[PDB]
Amino acid sequence: WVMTCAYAPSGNYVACGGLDNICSIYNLKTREGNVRVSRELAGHTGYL
Amino acid sequence: AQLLYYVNLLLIDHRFLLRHGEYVLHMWQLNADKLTSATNPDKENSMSISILLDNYCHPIALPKHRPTPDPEGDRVRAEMPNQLRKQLEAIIATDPLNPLTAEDKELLWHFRYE
Amino acid sequence: EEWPLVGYHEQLTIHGKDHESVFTVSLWDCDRKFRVKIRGIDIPVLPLTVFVEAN
Amino acid sequence: TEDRIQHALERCLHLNCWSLQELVSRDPGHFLILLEQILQKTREVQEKGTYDLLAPLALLFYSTVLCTPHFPPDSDLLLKAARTYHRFLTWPVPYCSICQELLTFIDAELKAPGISYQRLVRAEQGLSTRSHRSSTVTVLLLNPVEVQAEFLDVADKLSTPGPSPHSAYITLLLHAFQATFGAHCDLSGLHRRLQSKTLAELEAIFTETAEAQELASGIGDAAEARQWLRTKLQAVGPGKLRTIPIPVARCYTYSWNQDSFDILQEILLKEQELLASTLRVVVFGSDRIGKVARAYSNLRRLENNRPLLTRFFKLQFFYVPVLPILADMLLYYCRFAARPVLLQVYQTELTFITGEKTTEIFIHSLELGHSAATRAIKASGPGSKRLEAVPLTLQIIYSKGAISGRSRWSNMEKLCTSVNLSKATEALTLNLTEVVKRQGFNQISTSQIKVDKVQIIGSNSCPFAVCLDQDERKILQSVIRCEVSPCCLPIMTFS
């Protein structure tokens, strides 16, 4: 249930979120070059 | 009509109590067999029967009879009339493969000390 | 071998007793006609009319 | 009069009850005659063995012996009744378990007359003592748009506070004293003298009367208990016997347009100011108002796991299929119905895509997939404003069970958009909308198979949305395995 996304100005990070009430940040330039989840910014009490 | 299966169950168990609950029994398939009190070991292709015996808040025991003198025989000790005695003895004289008709049963039961 | 070493109608009838101290019922106090409930039959394998007949 | 009673009795054991309980109340003398007749019919059953006609008699006795204005000392009706119902201990459960609890009530009524009606009234009013304090509250959860205006009227009437603690204490004292001293007391003089007395002294008098009644009921011997109670009441202190009916209990009527039982905790705030105990929730019910059982679901587990209402009260829910006759019949049912009917709740073992596990319960149904997703968007609102079904690949093993213990297994791998489970030990009618051909339209093959137990395994890359009991607001996706098998606040039925 993704509702939003946001390319970082640097181009290294991308963010997304939705009804999960979490802003999942992903790193495109990963140590191993994979699409790895950098962070789960949780704390919001409603859909992102 | 052709009989296909059968099963038997004791209604009083081995410790003087009546049967209560749900019982599922396996079926022997068709003597001293038809008087069998065991369940079929073949639990894979055997006809099964499920029955219910109503529960009871307390055990349904069955007491032991107590021995009491029976004057019906003690003081009944004078020789019976020769005709009735003749009938009794003539009845007793047949082979054990002679089926006792109801009449004979009643006669013998009344004369249960001759 | 080591398998260790493994009443009367008056005591087993409700009548003459207070319901508080009832623990068993003699079989001879129950005048209800015997009753049994059948549920069904089940054969896993198919070999018409059928009918149980208890006796 | 006797033949009228016999006709009514034979026509109520076929609004035929209310008429019995309204013809006897006229004359203090009609309560013994009816009881005698009941015993005769009861004895016939005891002689015969007709299993199906005992519980209505066992409820009519309890109901009349508790409204009987007074039992003459000469009449030995209670002893004959106890001898008649003592011989049911040999009957199958539950008859012996209704008779044991009737015999206890007949000992409470043999030792302390009127105790079983003073307990009820005390409780229902909320006018208990500081030794044995209790309370009962009735909440009329009714939907204004569904209930009829006749029922709305009856509800309004019932809610109106009729009695006061003063009047309630006067009625309780009058009936406790009358039950014991029959006609030999002056109920007009006693009422006139009690009217001028103050509320506090009335409360003290009732507390002593209730303690004396309880202690007399506690005495082993019946014969001396009555004399001791009579002497105690004389120390505390021919006419015509008077029928004292049951005072209306406390009731509250709240407008329930919702389906969840959250309303109740909001009520509990004014309970902080309005105070084990018990709460009589009288749910008024329609066909779809299915969802009431779904709300029951929460209030069952939710509370069992987060006790909030149960902290003080024992809840009891009453289903109405939807003073005047409806008021009387309602109160009588709620008062004398005391045997619940628990409905089956299916159990589900869920393994999530993460790997966590927690057993759950679906009372009504279990939907999955396109149905689950559709309900997910129905519960979105602004989401559904800003927001075909690609099939979900599930390997499903369903087992058909039996009392014999021989489970017949079968299995299949499928690629179906949705799968809903629906109710017929029980049977679970199941639907499987297969995607015979994926595309914005997927071929739909509704498959109705009769499964009781099911085992669903979905690919970890194919999370499947799951709805339990049609609860559109809490669908569960991200599950990878689901194992389903057929597993205080009771609902209640009169029989």
Short mmCIF file of N, CA and C in Angstrom, two decimals, chain D residues 365-373 375 392-394 396 412 414-422 428-435 445-447 449 451 454 456 464-468 482:
data_model
loop_
_atom_site.label_atom_id
_atom_site.label_comp_id
_atom_site.label_asym_id
_atom_site.label_seq_id
_atom_site.Cartn_x
_atom_site.Cartn_y
_atom_site.Cartn_z
N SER D 365 -16.94 -15.88 8.94
CA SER D 365 -16.43 -16.22 7.62
C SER D 365 -14.97 -15.81 7.55
N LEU D 366 -14.33 -16.18 6.44
CA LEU D 366 -12.93 -15.85 6.19
C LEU D 366 -12.79 -15.59 4.69
N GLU D 367 -12.51 -14.35 4.32
CA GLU D 367 -12.33 -13.98 2.93
C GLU D 367 -10.86 -13.71 2.66
N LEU D 368 -10.48 -13.83 1.38
CA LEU D 368 -9.08 -13.70 1.00
C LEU D 368 -8.99 -13.24 -0.45
N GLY D 369 -8.07 -12.33 -0.72
CA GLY D 369 -7.69 -12.00 -2.09
C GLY D 369 -8.44 -10.78 -2.61
N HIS D 370 -8.99 -10.91 -3.83
CA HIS D 370 -9.70 -9.79 -4.43
C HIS D 370 -10.82 -9.29 -3.53
N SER D 371 -11.51 -10.20 -2.84
CA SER D 371 -12.49 -9.77 -1.86
C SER D 371 -11.81 -8.99 -0.73
N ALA D 372 -10.69 -9.52 -0.24
CA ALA D 372 -9.95 -8.84 0.82
C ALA D 372 -9.43 -7.49 0.34
N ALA D 373 -8.88 -7.42 -0.88
CA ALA D 373 -8.38 -6.15 -1.39
C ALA D 373 -9.52 -5.15 -1.59
N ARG D 375 -12.32 -5.00 0.06
CA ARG D 375 -12.67 -4.49 1.39
C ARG D 375 -11.60 -3.54 1.91
N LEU D 392 -3.36 -14.71 -6.91
CA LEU D 392 -2.46 -15.09 -5.83
C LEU D 392 -2.24 -16.59 -5.88
N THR D 393 -0.98 -17.01 -6.02
CA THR D 393 -0.66 -18.41 -6.22
C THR D 393 -0.61 -19.07 -4.85
N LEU D 394 -1.55 -19.97 -4.58
CA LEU D 394 -1.67 -20.61 -3.28
C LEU D 394 -1.80 -22.11 -3.45
N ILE D 396 -3.17 -25.18 -1.55
CA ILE D 396 -4.18 -25.33 -0.51
C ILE D 396 -4.44 -26.82 -0.30
N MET D 412 -4.27 -29.33 -3.99
CA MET D 412 -4.15 -28.79 -5.33
C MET D 412 -3.36 -27.49 -5.25
N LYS D 414 -3.06 -23.85 -7.07
CA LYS D 414 -3.97 -23.02 -7.84
C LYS D 414 -3.43 -21.60 -7.95
N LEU D 415 -4.07 -20.82 -8.82
CA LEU D 415 -3.70 -19.44 -9.10
C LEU D 415 -5.02 -18.65 -9.13
N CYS D 416 -5.59 -18.42 -7.96
CA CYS D 416 -6.91 -17.82 -7.82
C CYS D 416 -6.84 -16.45 -7.17
N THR D 417 -7.69 -15.54 -7.64
CA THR D 417 -7.64 -14.16 -7.16
C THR D 417 -8.09 -14.08 -5.71
N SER D 418 -9.20 -14.74 -5.38
CA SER D 418 -9.78 -14.66 -4.05
C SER D 418 -10.25 -16.04 -3.61
N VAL D 419 -10.58 -16.14 -2.33
CA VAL D 419 -11.11 -17.36 -1.72
C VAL D 419 -11.83 -16.97 -0.43
N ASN D 420 -13.14 -17.20 -0.38
CA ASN D 420 -13.93 -16.88 0.80
C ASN D 420 -14.50 -18.13 1.44
N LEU D 421 -14.54 -18.13 2.77
CA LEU D 421 -15.02 -19.26 3.55
C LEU D 421 -16.35 -18.85 4.16
N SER D 422 -17.34 -19.74 4.12
CA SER D 422 -18.68 -19.39 4.55
C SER D 422 -19.34 -20.58 5.23
N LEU D 428 -17.87 -25.78 6.43
CA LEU D 428 -17.41 -24.46 6.01
C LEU D 428 -17.48 -24.28 4.50
N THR D 429 -18.55 -23.65 4.03
CA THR D 429 -18.79 -23.56 2.60
C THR D 429 -17.71 -22.64 2.02
N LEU D 430 -17.01 -23.11 1.00
CA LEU D 430 -15.83 -22.40 0.51
C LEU D 430 -15.97 -22.10 -0.97
N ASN D 431 -15.44 -20.94 -1.35
CA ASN D 431 -15.49 -20.43 -2.71
C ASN D 431 -14.07 -20.11 -3.18
N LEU D 432 -13.77 -20.47 -4.42
CA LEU D 432 -12.43 -20.35 -4.99
C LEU D 432 -12.55 -19.74 -6.38
N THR D 433 -12.34 -18.43 -6.49
CA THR D 433 -12.46 -17.76 -7.78
C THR D 433 -11.10 -17.90 -8.45
N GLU D 434 -10.99 -18.89 -9.33
CA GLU D 434 -9.75 -19.15 -10.05
C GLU D 434 -9.56 -18.14 -11.18
N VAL D 435 -8.30 -17.81 -11.45
CA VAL D 435 -7.93 -17.08 -12.66
C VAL D 435 -7.52 -18.14 -13.68
N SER D 445 -13.69 -18.67 -12.04
CA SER D 445 -14.28 -20.00 -11.87
C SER D 445 -14.62 -20.19 -10.40
N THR D 446 -15.81 -19.76 -10.00
CA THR D 446 -16.29 -19.98 -8.64
C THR D 446 -16.43 -21.47 -8.36
N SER D 447 -15.61 -22.00 -7.46
CA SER D 447 -15.63 -23.42 -7.11
C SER D 447 -16.14 -23.56 -5.68
N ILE D 449 -16.73 -26.03 -2.82
CA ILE D 449 -16.38 -27.32 -2.23
C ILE D 449 -16.68 -27.24 -0.74
N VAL D 451 -15.41 -27.99 2.58
CA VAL D 451 -14.26 -28.26 3.44
C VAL D 451 -14.62 -27.87 4.87
N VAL D 454 -8.80 -26.64 6.49
CA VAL D 454 -8.07 -26.15 5.33
C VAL D 454 -6.65 -25.80 5.74
N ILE D 456 -3.62 -23.48 3.84
CA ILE D 456 -3.25 -22.62 2.71
C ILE D 456 -1.80 -22.21 2.88
N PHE D 464 -0.96 -12.54 0.46
CA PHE D 464 -2.39 -12.61 0.18
C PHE D 464 -3.16 -11.88 1.27
N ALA D 465 -4.01 -10.94 0.86
CA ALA D 465 -4.86 -10.22 1.80
C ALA D 465 -5.93 -11.16 2.34
N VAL D 466 -6.12 -11.13 3.66
CA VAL D 466 -7.02 -12.05 4.35
C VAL D 466 -7.97 -11.24 5.21
N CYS D 467 -9.27 -11.50 5.07
CA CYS D 467 -10.30 -10.90 5.90
C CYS D 467 -10.95 -11.98 6.76
N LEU D 468 -11.17 -11.67 8.03
CA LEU D 468 -11.79 -12.59 8.98
C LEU D 468 -13.17 -12.07 9.35
N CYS D 482 -1.52 -20.25 6.24
CA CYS D 482 -2.77 -20.11 6.99
C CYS D 482 -3.38 -21.49 7.17
#
